[PDB]
Design a protein around this motif. Sequence first.
Motif, PDB file in Angstrom:
ATOM      1  N   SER A 263       7.559  -9.896  -2.360  1.00  0.00           N
ATOM      2  CA  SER A 263       7.212  -8.506  -2.557  1.00  0.00           C
ATOM      3  C   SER A 263       6.408  -8.387  -3.830  1.00  0.00           C
ATOM      4  CB  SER A 263       8.445  -7.645  -2.703  1.00  0.00           C
ATOM      5  OG  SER A 263       9.152  -8.061  -3.825  1.00  0.00           O
TER       6      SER A 263
ATOM      7  N   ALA B 127       9.025  -0.263  -3.208  1.00  0.00           N
ATOM      8  CA  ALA B 127       7.818   0.422  -3.694  1.00  0.00           C
ATOM      9  C   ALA B 127       7.096   1.116  -2.556  1.00  0.00           C
ATOM     10  CB  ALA B 127       6.881  -0.550  -4.392  1.00  0.00           C
ATOM     11  N   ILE B 128       6.625   2.334  -2.793  1.00  0.00           N
ATOM     12  CA  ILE B 128       5.799   3.070  -1.834  1.00  0.00           C
ATOM     13  C   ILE B 128       4.462   3.415  -2.471  1.00  0.00           C
ATOM     14  CG2 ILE B 128       5.546   5.269  -0.574  1.00  0.00           C
ATOM     15  CD1 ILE B 128       9.039   4.118  -1.402  1.00  0.00           C
ATOM     16  N   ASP B 129       3.400   3.277  -1.698  1.00  0.00           N
ATOM     17  CA  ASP B 129       2.053   3.622  -2.142  1.00  0.00           C
ATOM     18  C   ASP B 129       1.969   5.110  -2.340  1.00  0.00           C
ATOM     19  OD1 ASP B 129       0.697   0.992  -1.866  1.00  0.00           O
ATOM     20  OD2 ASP B 129       1.398   1.221   0.174  1.00  0.00           O
TER      21      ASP B 129
ATOM     22  N   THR C  99       0.888  -1.170  -3.343  1.00  0.00           N
ATOM     23  CA  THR C  99       1.544  -2.383  -2.812  1.00  0.00           C
ATOM     24  C   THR C  99       0.634  -3.395  -2.096  1.00  0.00           C
ATOM     25  OG1 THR C  99       2.233  -1.074  -0.858  1.00  0.00           O
ATOM     26  CG2 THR C  99       3.845  -1.418  -2.581  1.00  0.00           C
TER      27      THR C  99
END
Lengths: 396, 600, 597, 142
Positions: A176, A208-210, A241
């Motif tokens: 990741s 994590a989110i964009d 990400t």
Amino acid sequence: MIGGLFIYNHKGEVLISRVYRDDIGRNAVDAFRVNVIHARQQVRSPVTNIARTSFFHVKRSNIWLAAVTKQNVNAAMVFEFLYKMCDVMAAYFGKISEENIKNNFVLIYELLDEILDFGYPQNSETGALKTFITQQGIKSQIGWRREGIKYRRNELFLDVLESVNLLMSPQGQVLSAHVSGRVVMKSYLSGMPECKFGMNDKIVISIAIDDCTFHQCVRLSRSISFIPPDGEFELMRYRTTKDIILPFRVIPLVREVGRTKLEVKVVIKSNFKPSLLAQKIEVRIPTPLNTSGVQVICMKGKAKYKASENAIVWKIKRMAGMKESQISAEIELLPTNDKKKWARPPISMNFEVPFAPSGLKVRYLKVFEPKLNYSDHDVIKWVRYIGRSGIYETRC
Amino acid sequence: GMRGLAVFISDIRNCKSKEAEIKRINKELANIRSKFKGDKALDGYSKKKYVCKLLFIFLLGHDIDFGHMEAVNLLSSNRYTEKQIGYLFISVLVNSNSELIRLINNAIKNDLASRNPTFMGLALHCIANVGSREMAEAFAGEIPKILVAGDTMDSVKQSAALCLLRLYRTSPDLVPMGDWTSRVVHLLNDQHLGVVTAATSLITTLAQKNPEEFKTSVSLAVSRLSRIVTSASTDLQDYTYYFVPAPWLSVKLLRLLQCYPPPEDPAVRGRLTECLETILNKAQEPPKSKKVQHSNAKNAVLFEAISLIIHHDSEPNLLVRACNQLGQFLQHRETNLRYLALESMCTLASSEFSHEAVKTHIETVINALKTERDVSVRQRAVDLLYAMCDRSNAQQIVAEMLSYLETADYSIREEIVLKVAILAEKYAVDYTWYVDTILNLIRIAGDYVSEEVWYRVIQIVINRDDVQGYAAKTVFEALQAPACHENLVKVGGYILGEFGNLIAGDPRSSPLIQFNLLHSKFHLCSVPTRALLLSTYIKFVNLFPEVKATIQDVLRSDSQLKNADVELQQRAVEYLRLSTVASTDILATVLEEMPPFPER
Amino acid sequence: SKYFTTNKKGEIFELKAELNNEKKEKRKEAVKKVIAAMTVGKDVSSLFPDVVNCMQTDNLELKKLVYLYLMNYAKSQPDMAIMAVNSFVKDCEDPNPLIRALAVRTMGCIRVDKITEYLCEPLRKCLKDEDPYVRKTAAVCVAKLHDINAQMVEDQGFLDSLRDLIADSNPMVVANAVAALSEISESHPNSNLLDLNPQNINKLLTALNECTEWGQIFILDCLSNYNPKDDREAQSICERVTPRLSHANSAVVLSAVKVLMKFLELLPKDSDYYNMLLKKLAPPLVTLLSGEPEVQYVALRNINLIVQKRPEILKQEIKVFFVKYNDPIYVKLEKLDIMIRLASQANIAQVLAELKEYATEVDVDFVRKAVRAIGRCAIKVEQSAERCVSTLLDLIQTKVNYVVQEAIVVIRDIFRKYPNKYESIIATLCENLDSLDEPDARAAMIWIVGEYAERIDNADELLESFLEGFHDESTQVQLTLLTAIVKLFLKKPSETQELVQQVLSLATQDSDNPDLRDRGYIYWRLLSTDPVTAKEVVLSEKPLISEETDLIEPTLLDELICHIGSLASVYHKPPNAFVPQVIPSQGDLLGDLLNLD
Amino acid sequence: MIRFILIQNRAGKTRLAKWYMQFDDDEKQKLIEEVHAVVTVRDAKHTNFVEFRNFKIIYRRYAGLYFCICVDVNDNNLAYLEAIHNFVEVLNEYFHNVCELDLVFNFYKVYTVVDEMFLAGEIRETSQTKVLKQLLMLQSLE
Ligand SMILES: O=P(O)(O)O[C@H]1[C@H](OP(=O)(O)O)[C@@H](OP(=O)(O)O)[C@H](OP(=O)(O)O)[C@@H](OP(=O)(O)O)[C@H]1OP(=O)(O)O
Ligand SMILES: [Cl-]
């Protein structure tokens, strides 16, 4: 001539396609996906050669249109065609979008076999085409700044500040990764300037989110425009990400010799332009709790073992891109605790780099002030790119 | 069941656009909200179906900001299909509303307190599925009681046990080790293997922090395993999967046993050994079915038994047997089996009782890599070669790595080049071997070669007269492939500037031929590379006076003296000037053989 | 195993029943849903008989839908689509132009052995059709068949059929014959299709007007292939070609340009006409730079070549190559190149003022190249040198780090082209010694101090500071430091013996770089040796450099000029390349793909 | 333990998602995408195991459907690989030659099947016989 028309979504999934010659395989698609759609450090050019295959592309909204061939084609022809295709498409279903492509697959195939026979652009004007096309398109549809600000000298500063996080296997698989960023703006500008800002298309507007959040002053409709607060403020904040530039690769060669010795070799490779220096580099290699002692040899920077920390800490002041260094250690063990083999903590790094690991690049910042006497050519402008390690970990 | 549900679902599918999809969903939401809000009461059929439609919409991605109250009513229905749906909704859509939570806990309490195992199981699953603190606090105390009561049905015990396990993982402090321990252990003797399976998962987690408290499980776990792995065809028919008896309970019993040391009772340790040997034996028997499911089920058990053997690290005959079986998997259709065999063998390499056994399989690993298609398997093959490499191994392993390198993909080169350099350094027998290795390394994969490493090889070659002529010929014959690596031109150009004389006498490697070879690379090179070749070329004017005129020719040329680069322009001038204005005695003084490096 | 495969229920079975419904609007909807499916990866091979039966129809929209589906198989699974050849033979007879063209295109996008049998006769019939949409297709399909194996003499009969087609009523038809032809001709045999073609040129140059934007584009390209023999042959071709701009902005122009450039040089240079044609070509090129960005890039890459061959043409038009702040980097950079190439005494005033604009903007990459561009200008035009150097000083005092360090690298190349001329400045440069971290910049300072040592009484304590951390320095910086400090000795043999030995001792005793080691010794064997004879080898005057670095070998250039339209004119490389070698390091190679230059 | 279970089609579309760990919806969405990108890229040569974030995934495809179990690094790969297949067989029996649309129209029922076979991140019941007997008793209830 044209050997393959491919339409990709924003993920580099081929939504729809037609291959006009048997040269162009599964291989061509991956090439485009990997080396252009997910380009990491490369600066895109409308045309690209990889493995003796040429790729032309246009970007429409979130869609990639690509054209492919293995021959010395007429380059201008390819691009012109692509705009006309986008002309034709947009007159059946409007906006060229993932949604709209998806809804019009059948028509799109239809358009393709007409607009393009064997890769040869054929007459493709909207009025002309009614006769040949059976299908129809499926359509779908201040307060933060003050008055009277004067400066002898109108200045602005932009700081791109990024933190890069990684979890990597010993075999080098990215398990990741994410970047957290923000652009800080520091502006001593007279009056009430409207600013027009431009960047590459990196940022899209415990997992994590964009995401991207902008200052209250920011308007959207490409580019963004604002009248900035005076002095220093956070223009935008973002997390990404995809397509991250990992400045270091850590290659661990840990080897358990019996239950008494431990052999540790670690190699780090800097992976950026040669003319750029990374700084404040540290590598933190952990040791087992029952460690009698350590012999460490390194020939770049310096290193020392710290028992309260259960770690070997290796420091390097500067390292240029495309370089390689190595530490090697021999570790002694006294194995009272019998069984419960050592669960290895990961190797971690710190570093600072003079670029944005997300790939964000600032393309422009236009200042226009309606009343006052100065203009954009009068504005002094500095940008800086600071990239820092966050949790940058590699299993060993 | 629910006609309105099928209709909504098929209406959704017939949509021709996301726009239309979102229209049909908003329509349903209006309808549901009306009916929920409306004057008319709904029959359960309707509550049931609409709650179930809202869940569908939630699963499509859209927000659901009502409905929870209606699904909570379904919990108090006496109709199974209504409770099911109510319980499913609150399990997938959890809100933090503390009135609902209290309400949901009552519903649970009634279902637990009924004696209906179907209702008990729905509530138990809800608890296990949501796992909230408020639920733990209401029921964590009760769950062990259900689990150890002599009257509760098997399925309820299965589900109670895993519920208790979830609660122990989320809310340990609500799960003290009370008086129920021994009876949970006793479950390992249940006739129902589903019950045994469930209890085993629980005890394994509990045994991680409470080993002494479940120490009695070992003996029971061992005798169960040995009855399972020897039972006949016509035994355990329920729990026989593709002729392999209770594969998953087997795995689980082997896993419980990894929480403890070898069994302290000599009897028990003996049974376990017969057990593990039986498993090893079965590996050598042929398939009873050619379906891949049989061998996988069989091998799951085999692998878990191999972990136990490694973890105990206490029976050398089993560890060796283990290596050898893994060695036999290395030639196999299944990429899966290749993968796992190499991984597991890497572990065994670092154990004393097993290191040498593993070394036994070097040829097999090398043959497997040589033909292997999957990258992750290749990688693990190379990791293994690294792990087993020593003074005996090293020349073979290095030979073979280099050989493989000559046709390898790009996927894998970088890591192998790295391993070759490191092993070369640890285990070099004679400076000539080291030199022969690196120069080859550089010849085949020089693009991944650390600068430091080609530095080393150039110094060794200076400090040892014996290998210089060998190094010169190797480089020369290497340099004369139509395609070659730039570091080869760096290393090659330096060696030849300094020792070209030792092969210059051969008429097929003459001073002229040497030069023109280099020069066919020059203008395809980087600047520091050309910088080196400008030094090489000037040593050549000196060593071989015969070709001074062609060299001076390239030095006087525009591309050299009007070079945009400082070093190149500075070297080409300095060097032309040397060859022109310098006395021969002077020239010879300046470009003597370089002195040997210091060794430090 | 075969789980989830059943074809007794689920989506496939539902679609199979809908494909047999006897309401055609429900069948049409099926075939749409099936096509939609293939595209998302579903196996729909089992539905093939059912989809093929939907072809038994009056309805056009329906039939055309079945064709699209069959085309999906044509490429992906060729054996699949063969199953329905016999339908294609009927449907190329069917009395609808639309269907005829539909059955033919599709037959020739299949690719196996058993295609030849069925396709030859029906193609023979299609090149002979009242409808020019059928012959337009048939023509392109001759190409398609050629690509399928076998020399085929009957195909050689089609090769005639194609030639006869170049003479035809309809510019769509002729256009596609030609494009088929030039493509055919390239592969594989040589000298094929050669004609006297005076009629052919005329037929093509009448065609080339009434034609659609595509038809011309092929025409021109084919035309350009020929070699005339006369002035007046060449001439009138040129006047015929001339109206083309901008039929279709992008490639119509650049294919004309290509043609007009090959033939141009065969002309007498008279002025009479030669000079007119050269004045004609300015407008249409310049207009391309108002198109979309991709096409700009191509046009610029082309203009760049054209400007080296005939600098005359666009000598006057530097204005259009000025950078708009919102062009893509690739269009910005290409423009910059051309500005240097058209930079001239007349225009420096502005150019230089523009480059100063750019060098103060927020795009670092573009800024950096713009200072280089200023330096390239000073090197190019001797009169600009003095003003450029002034502009460069201005910028250095703005203190923008990445501007300082580029400017100074440029300044050194400027000191090198104009020796003993900008000495005064050197102290103004040393004011910024602290703020240099890039390795190039450091070496440019160092080399500067090595030359011009004697101008600075302080050239000591400077080069001292750079020894402190002699490692952690770019080996480039070490090499430059070495030569600069042996330059300081030969120049001022007093306080120098300190430095000279320290620096020769590091290169010779410490550093593991064997190339650096060699160079240290070399100098040591002159200097701590014989004070005199070393001065001549090292301090000897080094000649002047000029910007023939950018320029392409005139030999190559001519080749590239002949390829004006194509990829080759974008890559600036002979086709044989992208269609004896040194493989650079991953360090080198990854590094190169970031150097915008 | 089992972290989560997914059934997805080629297209990326989820047909079951079962979670045994706390995640936000954004998070689940993200994970569902990521799993799809990992698994749809592998051909039949690859292993059925792949590391995924700080866990790993075991997966197999049936027709157009990917079954995926995300488990801990130290869990037994082949055991979970056959767990998937055992599950699929129960599905095949319960829905009488299961197809993808059975999982769409009976989505709520699929959760029952899963909860019978898995619970709290562990395998619960493996007997195809017993699971069916139970599922069919459930069905006949009102
Ligand atoms: O209340 P309505 O707006 O008229 O809608 C009806 C209907 O009620 P009606 O008998 O009054 O038409 C259905 O049948 P009942 O349950 O009232 O017998 C109901 O349920 P089912 O089709 O599942 O049985 C169905 O579904 P839904 O409210 O979910 O759309 C819905 O029918 P329409 O879809 O034709 O509105
Ligand atoms: Cl089992």
